[PDB]
Amino acid sequence: GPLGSMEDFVRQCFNPMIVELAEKAMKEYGEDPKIETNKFAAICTHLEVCFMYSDFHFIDERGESIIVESGDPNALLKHRFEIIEGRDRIMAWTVVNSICNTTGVEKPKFLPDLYDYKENRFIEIGVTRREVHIYYLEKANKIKSEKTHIHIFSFTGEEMATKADYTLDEESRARIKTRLFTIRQEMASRSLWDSFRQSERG
Numbered sequence: 626g627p628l629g630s631m632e633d634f635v636r637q638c639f640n641p642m643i644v645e646l647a648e649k650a651m652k653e654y655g656e657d658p659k660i661e662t663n664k665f666a667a668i669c670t671h672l673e674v675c676f677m678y679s680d681f682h683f684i685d686e687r688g689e690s691i692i693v694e695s696g697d698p699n700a701l702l703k704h705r706f707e708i709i710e711g712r713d714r715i716m717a718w719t720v721v722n723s724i725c726n727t728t729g730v731e732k733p734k735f736l737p738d739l740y741d742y743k744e745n746r747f748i749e750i751g752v753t754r755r756e757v758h759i760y761y762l763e764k765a766n767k768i769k770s771e772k773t774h775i776h777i778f779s780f781t782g783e784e785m786a787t788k789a790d791y792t793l794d795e796e797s798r799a800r801i802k803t804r805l806f807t808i809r810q811e812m813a814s815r816s817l818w819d820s821f822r823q824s825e826r827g
């Protein structure tokens with residue numbers, strides 16, 4: 626088929642909010658979305674996964690965890706996850722330090738992606754175009770902590786998580802996997818997938 630542009634793909638297939646947050650993150654770290662386009666798409670994909678991981682998960686009146694998949698969460702409910710990824714540097718650390726000083730959970734030395742109020746731990750989300758075990762070890766090596774929980778997804782449906790503790794039910798994780806499959810399939814239709822896959826480094 627005709628070769629599409631990654632710019633077009635990102636703008637067509639991600640919510641404008643996600644795209645805007647990704648552009649802002651790249652600007653902050655000194656890279657141009659129109660030049661490092663595979664990186665741009667990876668940032669959007671990862672941000673979306675972070676959002677999808679948190680979506681629909683609340684804590685109820687009794688203080689335990691439930692899923693409300695409809696946009697009418699009753700007002701006594703609190704979000705189960707705090708989302709860190711997508712915030713600018715200052716705000717991200719502001720949220721992390723808050724959680725930490727408040728819970729006694731010690732401060733991570735690198736920004737994690739989420740905080741889980743049910744399991745009382747930070748989470749690092751990975752999304753990899755390579756094998757999940759190799760990417761898990763890479764993430765883990767920036768952590769000598771042992772406290773930040775790691776959850777890796779690949780575009781082929783494999784996952785790896787710290788202590789084989791997957792945190793979420795099968796259906797929630799399946800939503801994420803389905804979305805990654807869709808992203809892969811659409812990129813492939815535009816002849817962008819091979820390059821995007823091959824461009825991952827570590």
Ligand SMILES: Oc1cc(-c2ccc(F)cc2)c(-c2ccc(F)cc2)nc1O
Nearest residue numbers: 650651654664667668671738750751752
């Ligand atoms: O797990 C993560 C991966 C990335 C990332 C690394 C390399 C890429 F090519 C793309 C994404 C990021 C990340 C998010 C925003 C940003 F500006 C840079 C890296 N975050 C994360 O939490």
Ligand SMILES: [Mg+2]
Nearest residue numbers: 650710711736
């Ligand atoms: Mg970030």
Ligand SMILES: [Mn+2]
Nearest residue numbers: 710736737738
């Ligand atoms: Mn992150």
Ligand SMILES: [Mn+2]
Nearest residue numbers: 738749750751
């Ligand atoms: Mn991450």
